[PDB]
């Protein structure tokens, strides 16, 4: 069930079993990488880049194409972006959570009596702390890194 709301929502994507790219894809792996890079330059996040590739360009998923530089792995949006040096400095989901947390704090300071929104902020910060702990364990971010709203203001800015 959901982490907090505790209700079972089984809505999601139904990926068919595949082992190779479709035969009707009109772009090569190099062209796919170029499209990913140009979209990232435009400014879309990884999820948006994947959605745009699926919709406009008819690319079901970059994960289907093998990695030309490492035969032991398949391609990925983040892997391509880090190959070109465009990978996000901070994980995207954590950054999104921090951004909306600082926005919620801005709202709460003006509306101190919004206790329900305060509880929402508490849940958001709990999610942020969980992700921070996981990223520290995996070594993605420095061990001395800590979440503090005052610094998060500048980080979001």
């Amino acid at each position: 069930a959901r982490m907090h709301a505790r209700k079972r929502g089984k809505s999601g994507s139904k990926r068919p079993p595949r082992t190779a790219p479709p035969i009707w894809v009109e772009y090569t792996v190099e062209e796919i990488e170029n499209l990913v890079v140009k979209l990232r330059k435009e400014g879309y996040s990884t999820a948006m880049i994947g959605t745009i590739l699926r919709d406009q360009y008819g690319i079901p998923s970059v994960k289907l194409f093998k990695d030309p530089d490492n035969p032991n792995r398949n391609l990925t949006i983040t892997r391509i972006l880090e190959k070109h040096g465009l990978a996000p400095e901070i994980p995207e989901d954590l950054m999104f959570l921090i951004r909306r947390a600082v926005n919620l704090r801005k709202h709460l300071e003006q509306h101190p009596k919004d206790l329900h929104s305060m509880r929402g902020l508490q849940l958001i910060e709990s999610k942020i702390r969980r992700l921070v702990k996981y990223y520290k364990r995996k070594g993605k971010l420095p061990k001395n890194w800590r979440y503090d709203p005052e610094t998060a203001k500048l980080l979001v800015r």
Binding site: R15, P16, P17, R18
Partner: protein
């Protein structure tokens, strides 16, 4: 959340047998589940079983022949020696040599009878009778 696929599969098999089903699906699949199914088929407690790939852990399709009285995983997986099998047999089975205790040993997973024949111990992973 999901913790013991083996226990889930064995409980599902038991419930399906009680209801009188002829076919069952086990998900997620694993090598341990595959080997346990192999042992059960060897001893004749189940019928034909096959593996199905779906881009995920995989699924097992199993035919039930209405021969299982009760199958269940053992938790915690108690270690056991060659000479310390009678107490577990009494605990988990109705009579002597009635069912089988599926044990994971250093030479693969096998029934406690095969383990005693080979003169080795292991850890009790399941039982079925």
């Amino acid at each position: 959340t999901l913790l013991d696929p083996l226990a889930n599969a064995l409980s599902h098999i038991t419930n399906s047998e009680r209801v009188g089903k002829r076919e069952v699906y086990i998900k997620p699949a694993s090598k341990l589940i595959g080997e346990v199914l192999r042992v059960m088929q060897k001893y004749g407690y189940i019928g034909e079983f096959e593996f199905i790939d779906d881009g995920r852990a995989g699924v097992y399709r199993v035919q039930l022949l209405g021969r299982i009285n009760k199958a269940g995983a053992i938790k915690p997986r108690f270690p056991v020696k060659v000479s310390e099998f009678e107490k577990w047999e009494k605990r988990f089975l109705p009579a002597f040599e009635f069912g089988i205790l599926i044990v994971s040993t250093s030479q693969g997973v096998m029934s406690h009878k095969e383990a005693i024949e080979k003169g080795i111990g292991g850890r009790l992973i399941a039982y079925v009778y």
